Amino acid sequence: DINFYTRQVIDPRLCGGLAFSPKLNLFRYLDAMSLSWNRSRLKISRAT
Amino acid sequence: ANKPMQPITSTANKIVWSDPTRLSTTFSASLLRQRVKVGIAELNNVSGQYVSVYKRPAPKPEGCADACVIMPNENQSIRTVISGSAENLATLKAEWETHKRNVDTLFASGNAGLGFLDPTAAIVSSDTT
């Protein structure tokens, strides 16, 4: 007769990925043109 | 080739480009859409406004080169306005092409830029034989 309970991690070093990793599809996304708001910042700084 | 510009102020009727290296140089385009009524026909008119500016210190005195000649910087602006009915754009283009050649023979090749006017300069119209 054996009766006990255990809980184990998903060892995220090995497993834990295999997902979408929402970094991508957003880092390759507008991060450049949104950064390009340097144009507007320069505009406001000129009149500042 | 030359230096391309990127737009710095975009709007539905206002787009302005400027050179990142020389922000003084600009090219602005303004479009004004309006509906005009002619005889038994409603017409959709558009006016094309185009302004090109180049800031530039013009003449180097005689033929030297030196540091302590930083003469005042002046401006060179060329403004072009085009108006006409939207659907007549097909023929609107050709006379614009004619307008190019027409001023070319007067200013680009003639001395109109100096201030002189040539009565016998060759001028042609859009239509052809």
Chain B residues touching A43 at Cβ < 8 A: 8-9
Distance from CA of A39 to the nearest CA of B (A): 6
In angstroms, rounded to a whole number, what is the distance separating the alpha carbons of residues B14 and B33?
12
In angstroms, rounded to a whole number, what is the distance separating the alpha carbons of residues B49 and B36?
18
Please, which residues bridge with residue B61 across strands? none
The B6-11 sheet, strands edge to edge: B6-11, B14-18, B26-38, B41-56, B74-85
B8 interface with A at CB cutoff 8 Å: yes
Query: What stretch of H or E contains B94?
Result: helix B89-103
A13 interface with B at CB cutoff 8 Å: no
Query: What stretch of H or E contains A5?
Result: none
* Residue B52 near residue B78 (C-beta atoms within 8 A): yes
* DSSP letter, residue B72: P
Q: What is the resolution of this structure in A?
A: 3.1
* Residue B24 near residue B8 (C-beta atoms within 8 A): no
- Count CB neighbours of B26 within 10 A: 19
Structural tokens at position B15: 């787009």
Please, which residues bridge with residue B6 across strands? B18
H-state helical runs in B44-118: 89-103
* Residue A10 near residue A16 (C-beta atoms within 8 A): yes
CA angle B112, B118, B124 (to 5 degrees): 95
Chain A residues touching B8 at Cβ < 8 A: 39, 43
Please give the backbone phi and psi of residue B52, each rounded to the nearest 5 degrees, phi first. -120, 130
Query: What separation, in Å, do the N-terminal and C-terminal C-alpha atoms of chain A show?
Result: 80
